[model samples]
Target chain A: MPVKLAQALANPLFPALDSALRSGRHIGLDELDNHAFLMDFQEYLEEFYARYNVELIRAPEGFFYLRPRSTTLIPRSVLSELDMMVGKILCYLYLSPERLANEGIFTQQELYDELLTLADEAKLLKLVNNRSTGSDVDRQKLQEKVRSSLNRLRRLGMVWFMGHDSSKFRITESVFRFGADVRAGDDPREAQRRLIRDGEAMPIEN
Target chain B: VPELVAWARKNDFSISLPVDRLSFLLAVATLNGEMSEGELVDAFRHVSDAFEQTSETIGVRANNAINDMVRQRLLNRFTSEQAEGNAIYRLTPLGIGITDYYIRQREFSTLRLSMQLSIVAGELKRAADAAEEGGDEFHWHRNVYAPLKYSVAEIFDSIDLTQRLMDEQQQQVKDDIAQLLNKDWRAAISSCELLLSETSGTLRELQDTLEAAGDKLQANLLRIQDATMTHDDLHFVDRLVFDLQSKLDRIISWGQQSIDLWIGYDRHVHKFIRTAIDMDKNRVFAQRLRQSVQTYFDEPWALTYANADRLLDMR
Candidate 1:
């Protein structure tokens, strides 16, 4: 009763913060208004989420996410082989000293070189091979795959391009959650082995 | 033999202590201060295991190593008159200095800043009290200026060494959380909760100490200015106060930044755990869908056949 629901709802930033949370975009420090608003009214916002059978979760790293309370309500999206492979590579880069030293920023060429070094030629050929792109050469197909994956990552708020049409981009802290996904349900040693093996080519799920 | 000695001298590895014994010395350096003979032996055994070099006569070897260090002035042996048991051993000043330097090189977890600041605050209080008594230049130098200068210098040294180490510690915690989460979800959550609890307590103490010291320093600066002191003495005291206050400000800033970082880590860990559980729940569905897609990819006719039953019923 101390902080009325109406008063909390009437805040100007509530709509923006709530919308971002609902849309699955993590509200980090970069999103100043939404982040601050959620931080300030976390209790009320959590209560609001509970009304919809979802939970508002805040990470200590200063980000906000909404998760459905029931497992049944959680959306199940199957990741493509490309998505898994790209996610694995991003997770490795996130923890690597090269990316850490660069402040989580890397050029498109640098990423390509890393990918090339990580994945064997055959695996790269297979990932980018498709009936629709039969005319495109292996190199062009590979570039397209990288671009598509980066675009997907950007949409997920896991990364941000440095500038418009720029080759450089920075991985956001949101990718930490993604790294958890890549390693989840595996033993530490197995997770590490899988990261290296899958980094080359993630096998299709069966 | 001559060639080996020459190579050793060139490499500056002329010290006679065995590598394992040196490891023991390093282990002892990490201890609070002194230990009994039994404790020293146990510590040596731990170091031996860490280095993966085992020996049956660990007790004798530890005793010999302790004796060697004692003779070399890296350790001091003491006897208890009342007690009839094994001797107590502690690091001498030389041993402490060498080990402290080693620690800085290794960049271990930072010592609590609040505790160090509290000690400095006490010394500052003494210096402040001395300044109020109206001392001559010699007395002022010995009591007020010397203590203040030394305390401030010590704090600066501590901060300089620990600043980078503290940042490294935060990164280490994040790495640990990732590893733990991969290994055991329940343990990872427990680790997050423990770190959050301990770090919050540390930050609380640090902030409280900074505020207390800042106020004390400000009051002392005023007291020093009011005291009947020489111009040079006043100038020196003023500069020391300013330096000390600046360090305090730096500590305060670091504390706030550290708190924010830990809080972020806690949130990230929790979210990651929840996501991992959700992913686990959907794993079966994801695998089935992938298999279905792969079947279609392998045989194009399977896709039409999969929908044929539904189409026939609808028609």
Candidate 2:
């Protein structure tokens, strides 16, 4: 191994990168120093991570994520919901010409309008509203849901708000990893269908 | 038209038309030739957010805006004897030019690149042939030098403009792919395939035109250099040939870049298609996951043995 590679194997930055990945944060190109560090020592990092039974995945969209062999590490419910939100945002990004033209930056109103157009009202309400028993979800509640979701996305480094209380937000390059994941799957749709079907067929808990 | 010109002069050649109003005029320009009064009003309403107003109110505003544009000589208004209720309106040359300028700013062009390049190539050949037949210096200047200069300028300008417009057009196509994916995945896939094919064909045509005509044009210019002429004239011709060669080189470079761009786009489109398909396939899983999350939140202890197993393997 090269001297730099040997040095990077013991580099202090590796732990920080590992922690970020473990916390479900995508280390993207925007984090210039970390991303460059990761790129330089990807092989060594991968081997280091492998010892912990965690796969250090370099997403084609120019980001790094971790996939652990033991699935009990993270809360499945949280991951599922995150995936749902990410998928919805991806669809919205693909659909909205105004948002796409603006380089994935959108105001709250624009986001609401485009999402309304892209999804069913009832489904959208359910996606955003936890207290929903019926389809009578209020617009205000939906807006709040979107705001809270944006905050979560910000923490995940998938999006960035223009200001502290700004209604405008831009999707970051990290989100493209979801697209990369889909492309990596062999019949991802079928896999999902099977999972869902099996989950639905499960006996109800009393 | 004269009165309109005089009015413009009186206003110091400045008419304050709102940017929003210009969109309506652009609609007129895009509408191609002419539109009925009702059609023009409909176009205005389509471009503007006048949902709060009644049709009559919108009609009044549209009429006023049309008349305002007519006075500015951006539109020509004609009242037909046969049509009493609605007047006809068409964009004036000035209106077309203004709209064209806006479109160009967005790097949009309606001209076919291969056709334009072929025409320039033909012009080069014709000008060279005409110059070769000229018996005197004045004839050489008129037939060969001047025509060649104009043709060369056209080639350079057209290629430069088309390259810019092609870049914008490609971006627009990418946008179109996203939009199409939302509507129909198959359509988006077909559109990508078509884009790849058409881009390849256009590139092939452009390259062929350059290859076939470029050497001949250079050869003709070289022959012209050998003709009995003043040192100054020879130098000027030499410079013209050099400039023409430079433009051709740039065009070649542009063609290579365009090919690379399309190749990247092809890869991206394939990935996008797979992603879109995966999303569709995963709809059931998404819904089930959402339900599971909702259930878990509702009752933390509701995690059955089966559910636990599923959740554990979710990674």
Candidate 3:
């Protein structure tokens, strides 16, 4: 509330991003700072999620939004468990921020495979247990389907695979545009955009 | 805001020493009285399974459960005049009905099994009803088999904490987790949409276990009677439980080893706030976490804490 979510983003934890997006503060990183700042920002996001138990995904529209968990109000260990899964979810968000930023990526069935690598079915169902949306598929498997979505999204270019097989995959900007020239490929977002963007993937000069 | 976040963090830590658990605690709190986030954390510390699942999962799912009860007019969410500000959540007449059902589940429970078994059936009905209302036909394990799995698993979670091993201090922690679990897991499972695979063995076991603390549940191993469980299948389950028991044992040991390390971390956090932020709390709260962890399992050998570093880094 005090600091715009975009500004607070520089600090890592994402409670502010929600405040910013909700209050109509759509700020872009301007290829926010490539190597140094972007990576650190992403780490900030990841660390926030890994520890605090929640995070945000910023799209190319230069808008960042929080990924709502299927469930909230869990035990500390369960939060830890979710944090364990955060790495994978974080990769998905990093590569496919647009889906989350706009709330559209893949159906639950689409991502099940990818999610399984990070969590168990019992753990997975904790997400889809509520929400009166989606098809008549059992609610428990929705999270598993989310795992498969990671796999599908990668093929869609909304996501990317770094290492052989699907073991090492992450979110990419091709799927989420940060702004006119600010794609994830261009920058990762930082305190000072210009300094970080040097020699990194740059947006169109125009 | 920094002060509030720190306060919230410390508040949550006090209620849940695990540094992550919240589901079971929240369920208990919402049912008991109005609580701020800080209060919610403090309340749940007395409950169990505070660190086993994601906090978000507990929040969202339990809210859904309350909503489900509300639809039947069993519960209602109190909203402020604007619907934008922070409003306290309270149970409606119907909500009280649902709460009473839970209370009965515990009060009259021979142990806590009936609540476990029947809660799933209700959850299943909610799912099916929700799907039907949407004009979507319910089918598959997601609606049926999987929910059943969680329901049964939750029941086990309650019973498992009953006896971790063969000691008094250990037995006490085991009881804490068990009683806390029955309260928490039952609420969570009941709020869930149910599965209908008709796998009643576990459900039945749940009924019997809570009735008499594994006495009836074990007496009637439906896997042998009702289900077509083969000797090998039973053997496999036995082996699995044994391994699980061993793993839990190791975790208990790991819990013992990590006490000092966590205390150090807690001090750092407390020190940060005290000196950096200027807050006041006589005790760090986490110092008790060592004993809490130690007593959580009946068998000190069930949990294996291979890398204590992971937990430290996690905090």
Cα-based lDDT for every prediction: 0.59, 0.59, 0.35
Best by the DockQ measure: 2
Interface RMSD (Å), every candidate = 13.3, 9.8, 23.8
Residue-pair clashes per prediction, in order, are 5, 1, 92
- Candidate 3 chain B: minimum summed lDDT over ten consecutive residues — where? B299-308
CA displacement after TM-score superposition, residue A64 of candidate 2 (Å) = 6.6
Instruction: For model 1, report DockQ.
Output: 0.05
Top-down TM-score ranking: 1, 2, 3
Interface RMSD of 2: 9.8
For model 3, residues A76-153, the per-residue Cα lDDT tens digits are 111122222332343343332122212223333334444444344443454455544444474445644445544544
The digit string of per-residue lDDT tens for model 1 on B15-90 reads 3556667677788888744477667778888987887655877667767787778767778888865433367878
Tens-digit lDDT track of model 1 for A15-35: 755555555566676667777
Taking all chains together, each candidate's TM-score versus the true structure is 0.47, 0.46, 0.18
Total clashes in model 3, counting residue pairs 3 or more apart in sequence or in different chains: 92
Candidate 1 ranges with C-alpha deviation above 4 Å: A1-120, A125-158, A161-206, B1-98, B101-119, B129-135, B151-173, B186-188, B222-235, B278-315
Error of 1 at B68 (Å): 18
Reference contacts preserved by each model: 0.00, 0.01, 0.00
Residue B215's lDDT in candidate 2:
69
Candidate 3: tens digits of C-alpha lDDT, residues B53-115? 556565555454444443544334565554332334455554454345334332223334356
> Model 2, which residues run further than 4 Å from truth?
A1-206, B1-140, B149-176, B186-192, B211-253, B282-315
